Amino acid sequence: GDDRELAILATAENLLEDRPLADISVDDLAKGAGISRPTFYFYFPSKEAVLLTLLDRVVNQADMALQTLAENPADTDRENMWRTGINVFFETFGSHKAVTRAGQAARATSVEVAELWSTFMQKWIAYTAAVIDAERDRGAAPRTLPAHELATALNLMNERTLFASFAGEQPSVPEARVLDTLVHIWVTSIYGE
Amino acid sequence: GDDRELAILATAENLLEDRPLADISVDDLAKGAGISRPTFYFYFPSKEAVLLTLLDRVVNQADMALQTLAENPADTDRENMWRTGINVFFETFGSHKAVTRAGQAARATSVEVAELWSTFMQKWIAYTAAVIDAERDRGAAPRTLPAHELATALNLMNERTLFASFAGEQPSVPEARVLDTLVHIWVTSIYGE
Numbered sequence: 001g002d003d004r005e006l007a008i009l010a011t012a013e014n015l016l017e018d019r020p021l022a023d024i025s026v027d028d029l030a031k032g033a034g035i036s037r038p039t040f041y042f043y044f045p046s047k048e049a050v051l052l053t054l055l056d057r058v059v060n061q062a063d064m065a066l067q068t069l070a071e072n073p074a075d076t077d078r079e080n081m082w083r084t085g086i087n088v089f090f091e092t093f094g095s096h097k098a099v100t101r102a103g104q105a106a107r108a109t110s111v112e113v114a115e116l117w118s119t120f121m122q123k124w125i126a127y128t129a130a131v132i133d134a135e136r137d138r139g140a141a142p143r144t145l146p147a148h149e150l151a152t153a154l155n156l157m158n159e160r161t162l163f164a165s166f167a168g169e170q171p172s173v174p175e176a177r178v179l180d181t182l183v184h185i186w187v188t189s190i191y192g193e
Numbered sequence: 194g195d196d197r198e199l200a201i202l203a204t205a206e207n208l209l210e211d212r213p214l215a216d217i218s219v220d221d222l223a224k225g226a227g228i229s230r231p232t233f234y235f236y237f238p239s240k241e242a243v244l245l246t247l248l249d250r251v252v253n254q255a256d257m258a259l260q261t262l263a264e265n266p267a268d269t270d271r272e273n274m275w276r277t278g279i280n281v282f283f284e285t286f287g288s289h290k291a292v293t294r295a296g297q298a299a300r301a302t303s304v305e306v307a308e309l310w311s312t313f314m315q316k317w318i319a320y321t322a323a324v325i326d327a328e329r330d331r332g333a334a335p336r337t338l339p340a341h342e343l344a345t346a347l348n349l350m351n352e353r354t355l356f357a358s359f360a361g362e363q364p365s366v367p368e369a370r371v372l373d374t375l376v377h378i379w380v381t382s383i384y385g386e
C-alpha cells in the first residue's frame with residue numbers, strides 16, 4: 001500500500017530527471033511502479049498529484065531541517081550561522097533538482113503547487129525576519145529596512161538564484177559558488193549600516 | 194501596414210491585462226485590430242509571436258533607457274546612482290505589467306522568449322559587473338566576491354522581486370517599497386566589507 005505509493009513516487013522522480021511532466025504519462029508511472037493504470041488511480045488522482053506530493057515531501061524536508069537548526073544553534077560566528085541556514089535549502093533542493101525544476105514549472109498551472117510554495121515561503125520569510133529582529137534587539141544589526149521587507153527580497157533572491165544554479169540556466173551563478181554568493185549578500189545587507 | 198501591426202500589438206497588450214495568452218485567440222486579436230483572421234497571419238505567424246514582439250519592445254526600451262543613463266551619469270551620491278539604474282527596470286517593466294507577467298509565463302514554453310530574456314540578462318549583468326569593477330578600481334568598493342557572480346545574484350534578485358511585486362504575489366514586497374528594498378541590498382552588498 002505505502003509500498004506501491006513509494007514506488008510510484010520514486011518512478012516519477014526518476015523519470016523527471018530525463019523529461020518534463022508533460023512528456024510523462026500515467027501509463028509510464030504505472031509501468032515503472034509495476035502496477036496497472038487503474039491501480040495507479042487508486043493511489044493518485046493524476047500525474048500532477050504525484051508531482052504535488054513529491055514537492056510537498058521536499059518542502060517539508062527543508063522546513064524540518066531548518067526547524068532542527070533553529071532548536072540547535074551551531075556554535076560559530078554570525079556569518080557561519082546564516083550560511084548553515086541557507087545551506088538547508090542548497091542541500092535539500094539541490095538533492096532533488098528534478099522535483100525542484102518540475103515544481104517550479106507547475107506553479108504556473110497548478111493552484112495547489114502555487115499555494116504550497118506560497119505557504120512555506122511565508123513561513124521562511126517570517127522566520128528570517130524574526131531572526132533579523134532578534135539581531136537588531138540585541139544590538140548586533142542596525143535598524144535599516146523593515147526586517148520583513150528585507151527578509152522577503154533575500155528569500156526571493158535565494159529562490160531564483162538557487163534554482164537557476166541547479167538548472168544550469170544562462171545566466172546563473174555556478175553551483176559551487178552560489179552558497180558563498182548568497183551568504184555574502186545576506187550578511188552585508190543584514191549587518192551593513 | 195505598420196498601423197495594422199501596431200493595432201494588433203495594442204490589442205494584445207490590452208487583452209493581456211484581463212486574461213492570459215492561453216485564453217486569447219488569434220480571432221480575438223484580429224477582431225480588436227479591426228482585421229480578418231488571414232490578414233492577422235500576414236503580420237504575425239501566431240499569437241505567441243505577438244507576445245514575443247511585445248516583450249522584445251519592452252526589453253529594448255529598458256535597455257535603451259539604461260544605455261542613456263550610462264552615457265549621462267546623474268550628479269548625485271553612489272546610493273542614488275544605483276537607485277536611478279534600478280529605477281529603469283522598475284519604471285519600464287512596471288509600466289507594462291501585463292506584458293511582463295505574460296512574458297514570464299512564456300519562458301517555460303517558448304525558446305525564443307527564453308533566449309531573448311537570457312541575452313538581455315547577460316548584458317545587464319555584464320554592465321552591472323563592469324560598474325562594480327570600476328568602483329573597486331577607484332578604491333570606492335572592497336574586493337569581496339567575484340564582481341560577475343555578485344552582479345548575477347543581484348540582477349536575479351531584482352528579476353524575481355520586481356516581478357512578484359508587480360503581480361501582487363504572496364509573498365512580495367509592496368510595489369511602493371520595492372525600489373528602496375532593492376537599492377539597500379545592492380549598496381550594502383557592493384560597498385560592504
Ligand SMILES: O=C(NCc1ccoc1)N1CCCC1
Nearest residue numbers: 085086089124128155158159
Ligand atoms: O535559501 C532560502 N532561504 C534561506 C533561509 C530562510 C530561512 O533561513 C534561511 N530559500 C527560501 C526558499 C528557497 C530558498
Ligand SMILES: O=C(NCc1ccoc1)N1CCCC1
Nearest residue numbers: 278279282317321348351352
Ligand atoms: O533591476 C534589474 N537590474 C538592475 C540593473 C542592471 C544594470 O543596472 C541596474 N533587473 C535586471 C532584469 C530585471 C530587473
